[PDB]
Design a protein around this ligand. Structure first.
Ligand code: K
Ligand code: K
Ligand code: K
Ligand code: K
Ligand code: K
Ligand code: MG
Ligand code: MG
Ligand code: MG
Ligand code: MG
Ligand code: MG
Ligand code: MG
Ligand code: MG
Ligand code: MG
Ligand code: MG
Ligand code: MG
Ligand code: MG
Ligand code: MG
Ligand code: MG
Ligand code: MG
Ligand code: MG
Ligand code: MG
Ligand code: MG
Ligand code: MG
Ligand code: MG
Ligand code: MG
Ligand code: MG
Ligand code: MG
Ligand code: MG
Ligand code: MG
Ligand code: MG
Ligand code: MG
Ligand code: MG
Ligand code: MG
Ligand code: ZN
Lengths: 53, 114, 125, 122, 207
RNA sequence: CUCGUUAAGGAACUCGGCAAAAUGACCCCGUAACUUCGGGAGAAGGGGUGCUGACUUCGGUCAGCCGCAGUGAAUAGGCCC
RNA sequence: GUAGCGAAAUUCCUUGUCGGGUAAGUUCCGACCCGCACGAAAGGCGUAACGAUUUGGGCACUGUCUCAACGAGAGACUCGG
RNA sequence: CACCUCGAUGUCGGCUCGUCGCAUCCUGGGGCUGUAGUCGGUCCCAAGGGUUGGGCUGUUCGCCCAUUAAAGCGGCACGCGAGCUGGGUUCAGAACGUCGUGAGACAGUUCGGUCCCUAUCCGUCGCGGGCGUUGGAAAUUUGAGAGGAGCUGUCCUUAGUACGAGAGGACCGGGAUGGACUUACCGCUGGUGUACCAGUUGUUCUGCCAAGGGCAUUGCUGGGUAGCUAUGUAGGGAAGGGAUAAACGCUGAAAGCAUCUAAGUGUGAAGCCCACCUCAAGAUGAGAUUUCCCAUUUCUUUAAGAAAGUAAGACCCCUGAGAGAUGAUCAGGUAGAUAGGUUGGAAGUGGAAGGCUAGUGAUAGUUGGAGCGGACCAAUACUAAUCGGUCGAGGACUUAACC
C-alpha cells in the first residue's frame, strides 16, 4: 500500500528511538589492561584466562 | 522416567515369554459380562510389539472367515491369563504391516523350530 | 535438537565432514559459532572411535572422513604419506586415551568483517 | 470413521452386496460413525435374485470397521474391511445369516440377534 | 477446601483393581511448606502462603530468606497462596504431605500450558483453512476483519499471536493413587503443562 | 512459494475431478460395438521381469536363493460409455 | 416449406410431458412434436477415424474435501553491508 | 426524488470471519382453549446458546433426497474482491434462431476469454523498552473493571401409573449414555519425523576383493525416537443463590362488597447480578501484606539542592530450553550438572564387521535379540559457562491521641 501522508520529522525521530545500537560486554583484560569483550579473546595480546593463544 | 519405572514395576508382569513379531501366539483373553467371565482363545501371528515397560502393546492378526482381524492387547493386563507361543516364525522385520495386503498362501510365515 | 547452518541435509553433512577432517589435520581451526558448536560433538564422536581402535570403528569413521592427507611424516623420500584416518587412529586416540570427554575447546574471537559473523577458534586439548 | 458417500460391504444374505452411506444418524452434524452406529444408505450392488435390490433406500448397522473399536482394558479390535448389516426399523436384520466376524460392541447397543446369528463375535 | 502444589513428571498407563486401564499423570509433591498466614484484620482475606521446591541459597536472595526464616525452612522456588481453607488447621512451618488426599477423591488442577509460540488463527482458534485448489489464493488466513460501516475492526476478532503460556484449570479429575514414601500423586488424565512445570492441586469447587 | 508424507473415508470439494494423485519401459497372451474394411487398437483386460547353477543349439527351459517390493532408483499412456 | 430433422449450438412459455440414469439430476441420453423464431450447397439428414474441441456418466486414483497435521528448502524474522 | 459519488462506483453468487436486532425456528416460563391424555392451536415474556449434509442450476431463491430438538426472518455499502474465487455478467473471436437492403443488433441462446498494490496512520491480535506509582529492591496478592463458556437429544425409572369406554398414553422427580462445541495433553490408537535403523537399483569414488561414501525427489522402499499432533485420550458447560419479566398471587383500601396494589408482602424463566475459568493496580483513583538495604562522602545551602562512590538488588556478558520472530520468560554461571562430550541405559531398527561351517554358487547358519543408536533418562566438571564491569537508596510538607 501507499503512505497517503508524509510522516513528520517528529514522527520519524520517534520511530528512531529504538533504532539505536548498543555495545556491551566490554571489560578490561587483566593482562594488558586494554578493553575486550567479555568471553572473547583479547585481540591485542591474544590471552584468555591468562593463556596465550 | 526413573520414578515412572519405580511406580510401574509392581504392575509389570512376569508370566510373559520373550516372543517377537512373526511368531504365532494364542491369547487366553478373558471377557467380562458382569454376570460371567469367559476366556476365549484368540490365535494369530504377531505383527508388532511396541512400547516401553508398561506402555508395551502387541497386536495379533487372524483370518477368521475371510476377514482379516487385528487385535491389540497391552502386554501387562490381568485380563490376559496366558500367552502361548506355538511357532517361532522367521522374518527380517519387526513390523509386519505387509501382511494386511496379503491373503493366505503368501501370508505364511516360515517356521524355524527355534 | 540440532542445528541446520543454512544448508540442506546433504550440504551440512558434507560441510561437517570437510571441517572435521580439516580439524583433525590442523589440530586447530577458525570457524563460526554454530558450525563449531556442532563440529564439537562431531569430532568428539570421531575421537571416541579413535580410542576404540577396532576395525568396526575404523569403518564407522571411514564412513565419515574424507580421506584427506594430514602430513607427509617423511624419513627418506616420500614414503610416509599419512591420511587423516591414520592420524585419528595413531596420533589422537593415544593422545586422549585418558580423558573421559572434552577433546576440544572453543574460543570466541573477532567478528568477521564482511558479515559481522561471530568467529570462533576450535582447538584440541 | 465412516462418512457420507462411503461404500461398505454387506455382511448378511438380505440381498445386498455393496452399500453407500447416505447419512449417519444420531444428532444433527454427526459426520462420522463407527461400530454400533446406525446408517442410512442406498444399495449400489445387489444379489440378482435378492429381496433388497438396486436403488433401494434402507437403514443399516456398522458391524466391523478398519478404524476399529476400543475396550476399557486397552484391548482394541480392527479389521481389514468396512462392512454393515441391513436392518428394519426394529434392530432386527432384513436377511437371516451374517457372514464374517462381528465386534462385541453391539451387545451394549442391543443388536443381540445379530450377535447371535454371527458365527464369531470378537 | 485444601490443596497442594507440585511438579509434573509425565504420563503412564495404569490398571485399577481390574483390567480397566486408566491413563495417568504423575505429580511429584515433595512436601509443601506453609510460610505465611493471611487474615482479614491485617491482609483483607483468609489465606495461606505455601512453598514447594527448594532452591540453592546462592540462587535465592536475602529478602526471600527473611520471609522463609519464620517457618524455619530453606529457600523455596515456587510460592503460591491457597484460599478458602481452614486457618485453625494450618500453622506456620507446617508441612503438607500428600497423605492429605485420598485416592478416589475429586480434584481440580491448575497449570501453565505448553508454549506453542507465535501461531496462526487456524491452530490458535480452530478456524478453517480456505480451499487449496480451484484457483484459491486463500489458504491459511483468518478472513475478513468485519463490516465497512464501523470503519474499524471490532475487538475479539481472533488472529495470530502467542499460543500457550496461559493458566488453565482442569476440573472434576480423580486421584488414582498416592505414594507418600515417594511423595507422588497419580491423577486420572492429562493436565496442562510441560514437564518439570508447576501444578496446583485443589479439592474440587464444583463437588 | 516450491517440494514430500498421511490414519479412516474417498469427489462428499467444486461452476466444473481445477490441480495433484494414479497409469507409464520391454516380452507374451488377449482385445468389443462400429467401420469409408484402412482402421478402431498400444482398445480393453491380464500375467511376467531380480540373482545363481544346469539346459539348450542360444530364446525360450528346469531347479534353487533372497527380499514388503525385481523396467527395485530416473526417464516413458489413465481408461471406458 | 417438400424430403429429412425437431424443447435442437435453434423452444420464449420451459426446470415442457413421458422414460432411463441418481437416494435426490433446471444439466445429460432417448421418444413425443403447440417448430414463440428448423429446413435443404447462408446447404439438410447421417457418418468410421481424428480433436490440448464442448457436454454428461462410470472405474481406478488420490489432501480436492470431511478436518486438517507434520517435515524439508527460499523469503519473511535478528545481525552486518 | 436525483441530494453525494463519473480527475473511478467493483457487478451477482459462493468461500473465510463473523457481529447485531427481535417481528423467537428449538430449548426456557406462562395465560386461554372448541386444552380428556399424547400431539397441539393461539397469544404474552424471553435474543443465553444452537439453528445440518447432499443432487439440479453460475445462481439467491426454489424442488428433491435424508436427518434434525430445530433446520428462524432480516440488517451490517442486498457485510466482507488493498481477504479469496470469477461460475454469471453480450469487452474484443465465432456460431444458431429472429430482425434489418446492409454495416450490425437481441425481442433469445451457445463455446471461449489478463481480478494490479512491498500497509504510512487509525483499527485489531500479540510481545517489548522507557517512565511513573514520592527512599531503593525481591516476592505473594485483594480486586474495580473486562472477557470467555452458556446448547441439546435418546434411553431407563416413576409407570403402562394419571388420563381416557378403549386405542393409545403422561406431568413432577431421579438416573444412564450420546451428539455438536470447546480447554488441555500425547500414556494408549494412528500420522509426521530430510544428522535414527535396515533393505535395495544404477553409476562413480575410497588402488582392487570385502566393507563403505557421493548423486539420482530424503534415489526408492519398509519401519520409527523426541517434538508437533487429531481422527486419539481426559475433562467441561454441575448443583445453587439474589432480584426480576410475563403470569400466579396473600392481605387490603380507595368504592361498606369486590379487587394481586395504592401503601405492605411473596412465588416466579435457558434470560439479568453472582456462582465456573481466564486477564487485571498504567484501577495516574497507580491499592494491600511479608521480607531486605540502610540514613554515607564532598560541594553548595537553607536548596523536596548538585555529583560520586556504594548497601539490598538488578543488569550486561556467557552455557541453554520446559521458552522463543527479535526483545522477553525460565533454568544456570565452578558456592556448578546449564549445554556439549564420555560412560551407562531406554525406545527404535533388526541379527553388524571380521571369522568359521555348509553349499557348485547364489545364499543360509553360528560367533551374538548382535551391532548401530538425533533430540529420551541417570550419572560424570573432561570442554565451555573465565576475568570482570555498569546501574542502583539514603528518604518533602500540613494536620490529627504524644499522633
Ligand atoms: K468513526
Ligand atoms: K421438439
Ligand atoms: K427456433
Ligand atoms: K462515478
Ligand atoms: K474491503
Ligand atoms: Mg540428495
Ligand atoms: Mg498456491
Ligand atoms: Mg488419506
Ligand atoms: Mg458436488
Ligand atoms: Mg488435470
Ligand atoms: Mg524405474
Ligand atoms: Mg429436457
Ligand atoms: Mg434450393
Ligand atoms: Mg438457415
Ligand atoms: Mg440456400
Ligand atoms: Mg455445414
Ligand atoms: Mg479522487
Ligand atoms: Mg417478543
Ligand atoms: Mg456442496
Ligand atoms: Mg455426480
Ligand atoms: Mg454485498
Ligand atoms: Mg466467465
Ligand atoms: Mg463479436
Ligand atoms: Mg435477411
Ligand atoms: Mg481454453
Ligand atoms: Mg499484506
Ligand atoms: Mg485441540
Ligand atoms: Mg501420541
Ligand atoms: Mg512417547
Ligand atoms: Mg565391491
Ligand atoms: Mg559425484
Ligand atoms: Mg552429476
Ligand atoms: Mg424470588
Ligand atoms: Zn589483553
Amino acid at each position: 500500500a501507499v503512505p497517503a501522508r508524509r510522516t513528520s520529522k517528529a514522527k520519524k525521530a520517534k520511530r528512531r528511538t529504538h533504532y539505536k545500537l548498543t555495545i556491551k560486554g566490554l571489560n578490561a583484560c587483566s593482562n594488558c589492561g586494554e578493553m575486550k569483550k567479555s568471553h572473547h579473546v583479547c585481540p591485542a595480546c591474544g590471552h584468555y584466562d591468562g593463556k596465550d593463544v | 522416567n526413573p520414578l515412572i519405572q519405580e511406580l510401574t514395576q509392581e504392575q509389570l508382569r512376569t508370566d510373559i515369554p520373550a516372543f517377537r513379531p512373526g511368531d504365532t501366539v494364542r491369547v487366553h483373553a478373558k471377557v467380562v459380562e458382569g454376570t460371567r467371565e469367559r476366556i476365549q482363545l484368540f490365535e494369530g501371528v504377531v505383527i508388532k510389539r511396541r512400547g516401553a515397560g508398561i506402555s508395551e502393546t502387541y497386536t495379533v492378526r487372524k483370518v477368521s472367515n475371510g476377514v482379516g482381524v487385528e487385535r491389540t492387547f497391552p502386554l501387562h493386563t490381568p485380563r490376559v491369563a496366558q500367552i502361548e507361543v506355538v511357532r517361532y516364525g522367521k522374518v527380517r522385520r519387526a513390523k509386519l504391516y505387509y501382511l494386511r495386503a496379503l491373503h493366505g498362501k503368501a501370508a505364511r510365515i516360515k517356521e524355524i523350530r527355534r | 535438537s540440532y542445528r541446520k547452518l543454512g544448508r540442506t541435509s546433504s550440504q551440512r553433512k558434507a560441510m561437517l565432514r570437510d571441517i572435521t577432517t580439516d580439524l583433525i589435520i590442523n589440530e586447530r581451526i577458525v570457524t563460526t559459532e554454530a558450525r563449531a558448536k556442532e563440529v564439537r560433538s562431531t569430532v568428539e564422536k570421531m575421537i571416541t572411535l579413535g580410542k576404540r581402535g577396532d576395525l568396526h570403528a575404523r569403518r564407522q569413521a571411514a564412513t565419515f572422513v574424507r580421506n584427506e592427507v594430514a602430513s607427509v611424516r617423511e624419513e627418506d623420500e616420500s614414503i610416509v604419506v599419512e591420511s587423516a584416518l591414520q592420524k585419528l587412529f595413531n596420533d589422537l586416540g593415544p593422545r586422549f586415551a585418558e580423558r573421559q570427554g572434552g577433546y576440544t575447546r572453543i574460543l570466541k574471537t573477532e567478528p568477521r568483517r564482511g558479515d559481522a559473523a561471530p568467529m570462533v577458534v576450535i582447538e584440541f586439548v | 470413521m465412516i462418512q457420507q458417500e462411503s461404500r461398505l460391504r454387506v455382511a448378511d444374505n438380505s440381498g445386498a452386496r455393496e452399500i453407500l452411506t447416505i447419512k449417519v444418524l444420531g444428532g444433527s452434524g454427526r459426520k462420522t460413525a463407527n461400530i454400533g452406529d446406525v446408517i442410512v444408505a442406498t444399495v449400489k450392488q445387489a444379489t440378482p435374485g435378492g429381496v433388497v435390490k438396486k436403488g433401494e433406500v434402507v437403514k443399516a448397522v456398522i458391524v466391523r470397521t478398519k478404524s476399529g473399536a476400543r475396550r476399557a482394558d486397552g484391548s482394541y479390535i480392527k479389521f481389514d474391511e468396512n462392512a454393515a448389516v441391513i436392518i428394519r426399523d426394529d434392530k432386527s436384520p432384513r436377511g437371516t445369516r451374517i457372514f464374517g466376524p462381528v465386534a462385541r460392541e453391539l451387545r451394549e447397543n442391543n443388536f443381540m440377534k445379530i450377535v447371535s446369528l454371527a458365527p464369531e463375535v470378537l | 477446601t485444601k490443596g497442594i502444589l507440585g511438579k509434573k513428571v509425565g504420563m503412564t498407563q495404569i490398571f485399577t483393581e481390574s483390567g480397566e486401564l486408566i491413563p495417568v499423570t504423575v505429580v511429584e509433591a515433595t512436601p509443601n511448606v506453609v510460610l505465611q498466614v493471611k487474615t482479614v484484620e491485617t491482609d483483607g482475606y483468609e489465606a495461606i502462603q505455601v512453598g514447594y521446591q527448594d532452591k540453592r541459597e546462592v540462587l535465592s536472595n536475602k529478602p526471600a530468606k527473611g520471609h522463609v526464616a519464620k517457618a524455619n525452612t530453606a529457600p523455596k522456588r515456587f510460592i503460591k497462596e491457597f484460599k478458602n481453607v481452614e486457618l485453625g488447621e494450618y500453622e506456620v512451618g507446617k508441612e503438607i504431605k500428600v497423605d492429605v488426599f485420598q485416592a478416589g477423591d475429586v480434584v481440580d488442577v491448575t497449570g501453565t500450558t505448553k508454549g506453542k509460540g507465535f501461531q496462526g488463527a487456524i491452530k490458535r482458534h480452530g478456524q478453517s483453512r480456505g480451499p487449496m485448489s480451484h484457483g484459491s489464493r486463500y489458504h491459511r488466513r483468518p478472513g475478513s476483519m468485519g463490516p465497512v460501516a464501523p470503519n474499524r475492526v471490532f475487538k475479539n476478532k481472533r488472529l495470530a499471536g502467542r499460543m500457550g503460556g496461559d493458566r488453565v484449570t482442569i476440573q472434576n479429575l480423580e486421584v488414582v493413587k498416592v505414594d507418600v514414601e515417594r511423595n507422588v500423586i497419580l491423577i486420572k488424565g492429562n493436565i496442562p503443562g510441560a514437564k518439570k512445570s508447576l501444578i496446583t492441586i485443589k479439592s474440587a469447587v464444583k463437588a
